[PDB]
Amino acid sequence: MEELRERVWNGTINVEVVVSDAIVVPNTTLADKSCHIVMLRDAYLGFYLPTVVRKLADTIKVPYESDYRNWWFEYNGEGVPWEYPCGVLFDLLNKQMWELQLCHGDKYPRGILPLVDGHSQIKDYWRHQWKQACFILNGSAKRIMSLSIPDFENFWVSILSRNRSDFMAVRSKLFSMNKAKSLPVRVWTSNYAVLQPTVPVTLSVAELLDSIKLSSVKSVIIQGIDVSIEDNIFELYDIFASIDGFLYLVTK
């Protein structure tokens, strides 16, 4: 009923952040170059960047201008596409602790969006994501462009303060499930690519995958839980959409 929605909002994942070999100070203990932090599934890796940098600043041999510019995370030697919520990335990349390396360099890895203005920047992007999931839901950025500044600012703040009722409050002023054209969906392939399937409302997971050539495999990964390829997508959205407005499916 409401039980689930709570667990999801409070979704957590254990994360071990270790300085990368490239920038760590010569032969320092693993314990010293590591730190474990619990991250919210529906949050952004970028929210944790400065904290991680702070905790390990001692073990970093290289010099740095800030706690944002030129930093990124790597999982198994690959840059993490941090513009997606943590939980989504965890579901997509992990083999329950998730190990990431903290890296710094003058040249960002190929394809990784540079994080230069911390929260301000994450804000803008998250914003435009909703400004988008809106069109998908209502054919026009009406409901969302109508929100007063403090009402939206309050929307943002809800994600930082973890005030759920505050979040659901404005989410409502944006869309109603019972009155939505198409729903925001994004599917991850086996090779780590995202498809954004046009799914108008009028479909099961299995039915969605087929129409997009991705079936194989009985369970999908959503919000960290194996969902039967039979479930109803319209429903999976109403309960599992991520803080950015999209329901993410990770194929197996």
Asked whether the beta carbons of 107 and 69 are under 8 A apart, the reply is no
Cα 241–245–248 angle (5° rounding)? Answer: 50
Place of tokens 């693993």: 30
CATH topology of domain 1-108: Ubiquitin-like (UB roll) (3.10.20)
Domain locations in the chain as residue ranges: 1-108, 109-180, 181-252
The sign of the torsion formed by the CA atoms of 165, 169, 171, 175 equals positive
Q: How many CA atoms lie within 13 A of 7 on its CB side?
A: 9
CATH of domain 181-252: 3.10.20.90
Count of CB atoms situated within 10 Å of the CB of 152: 18
| 75 bridge partner residues | 78
In one letter, which amino acid is 77? G
| Rounded Cα–Cα distance for residues 204 and 252 (Å) | 16
Experimental technique: X-ray
Asked whether the beta carbons of 205 and 220 are under 8 A apart, the reply is yes
| Rounded Cα–Cα distance for residues 138 and 144 (Å) | 10
The residues near 81 (Cβ < 8 Å, ≥ 6 apart) are 89, 111, 112, 113
What three-state secondary structure class fits 69? coil
| Rounded Cα–Cα distance for residues 225 and 250 (Å) | 10
| b/e sequence 7-17, b meaning 16+ C-beta within 10 Å | ebbebebebeb
Closest C-alpha to 103, from 23, 15, 16: 23
Q: Given 2.40.40.20, 1.10.246.190, 3.40.640.10, 1.10.10.200, which CATH number is that of 109-180?
A: 1.10.246.190
| Rounded Cα–Cα distance for residues 174 and 110 (Å) | 35
Give the orientation angle of helix 149-161 with respect to helix 118-138, to 10 degrees. Answer: 110
Count of CB atoms situated within 10 Å of the CB of 31: 7
Q: What is the DSSP string of 94-123?
A: ---EEEEEEEE-SSPPTTPPP--SHHHHHH
The residues near 83 (Cβ < 8 Å, ≥ 6 apart) are 44, 113, 125
Q: Where are the beta strands (DSSP E) in the chain?
A: 12-19, 34-40, 71-75, 78-79, 97-104, 185-188, 194-195, 219-222, 225-228, 247-250
Strands 185-188 and 194-195: antiparallel
Place of tokens 């505050």: 166
The sign of the torsion formed by the CA atoms of 244, 166, 46, 67 equals positive
The angstrom resolution of this structure is 2.5
| Rounded Cα–Cα distance for residues 96 and 148 (Å) | 41
Q: Where are the beta strands (DSSP E) in 110-231?
A: 185-188, 194-195, 219-222, 225-228
| Rounded Cα–Cα distance for residues 49 and 140 (Å) | 34
Strands 219-222 and 225-228: antiparallel
**Fold agreement (1-108, 109-180):** no
Asked whether the beta carbons of 101 and 55 are under 8 A apart, the reply is no
What three-state secondary structure class fits 143? coil
Closest C-alpha to 42, from 167, 146, 143: 167
| Rounded Cα–Cα distance for residues 240 and 217 (Å) | 20
* Rounded CA Rg of the chain: 19
Asked whether the beta carbons of 72 and 44 are under 8 A apart, the reply is no
The sign of the torsion formed by the CA atoms of 160, 163, 168, 174 equals negative
| Rounded Cα–Cα distance for residues 9 and 4 (Å) | 9
